[PDB]
């Protein structure tokens, strides 16, 4: 009921785990509950260490590497990361041909290159360049080409959450100012999220 996708300070969560579980014995396969960021997490013991031990003693200088459960949205950031991990990557397992789209290979390639190229590379290069990123894209063509299908599929292609849909000119309303209210609400969630999470 309290699922969350916000990033977690792996160093701090490991430190708090050690602090709360100091002078304790942990065995392979043990399951417990850990409170971090005022949130309860079900932790399952996988392996200990270099000679492997079935049961070990958790101490202050011990470090813990957390792995997310299968299909879980838990985003763990930092260096204490093991096994396969994918939460923020512009190139997911998404296939361009499973969707059943037609022969628009050149257009899709141009879209990818001109839009998602910026976010793929690490922050170092973009920060050194110090340039902004695109925030708009427009299509146009004769009816029944696939604009809606292509847009919704791109909506799923990115490794992000579900998008918002504005079906036609539903914004207009008799009460003046209410349209401004609706558009402001449309952007308020993203504005607040960016303000909270920083860069």
């Amino acid at each position: 009921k309290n699922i969350d996708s916000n990033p977690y300070d792996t160093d701090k969560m490991a430190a708090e785990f050690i602090q709360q579980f100091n002078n304790q014995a942990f065995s392979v396969g043990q399951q417990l509950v850990f409170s971090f960021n005022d949130k309860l997490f079900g932790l399952l013991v996988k392996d200990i260490e270099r000679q492997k031990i079935e049961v070990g003693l958790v101490v202050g200088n011990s470090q813990v590497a957390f792995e997310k459960a299968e299909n879980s949205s838990l985003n763990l950031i930092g260096k204490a990361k093991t096994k396969e991990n994918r939460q923020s990557i512009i190139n997911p397992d998404w296939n361009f041909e499973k969707m059943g789209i037609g022969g628009l290979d050149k257009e899709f390639s141009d879209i990818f290159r001109r839009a998602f190229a910026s976010r793929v590379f690490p922050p170092e290069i973009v920060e050194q360049m110090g340039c902004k990123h695109v925030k708009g894209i427009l299509l146009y063509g004769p009816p029944g080409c696939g604009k809606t299908l292509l847009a919704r599929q791109i909506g799923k292609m990115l490794n992000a959450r579900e998008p918002k849909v504005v079906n036609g000119p539903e914004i207009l309303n008799k009460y003046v100012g209410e349209s401004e209210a609706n558009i402001r609400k449309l952007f308020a969630d993203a504005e607040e999220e960016q303000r909270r999470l920083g860069a």
Partner: protein, 106 residues
Amino acid sequence: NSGLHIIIFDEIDAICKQRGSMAGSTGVHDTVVNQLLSKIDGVEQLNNILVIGMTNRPDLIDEALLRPGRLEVKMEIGLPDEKGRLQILHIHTARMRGHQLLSADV
């Protein structure tokens, strides 16, 4: 697992015309046309709606509303032939003939 819903328009060319353009007025016609086009077939898919349109000026309807997937079946109804006329008269005089109120010389 749902029933079916039927919507019937009359004189579809009254509200729906060439999108934009016109140059005479753009009060609410463009918004109405866009809203209809989006609602009839937009991002979401519906499978319990049927739409029937009737008109007398086929060439004035917006093409975007006539491409396949929205309004495919188009029918031109022509004047009946001699057999059609005979059938129409028979249908419309069956009731008369039922109570033998028609002269034998007709």
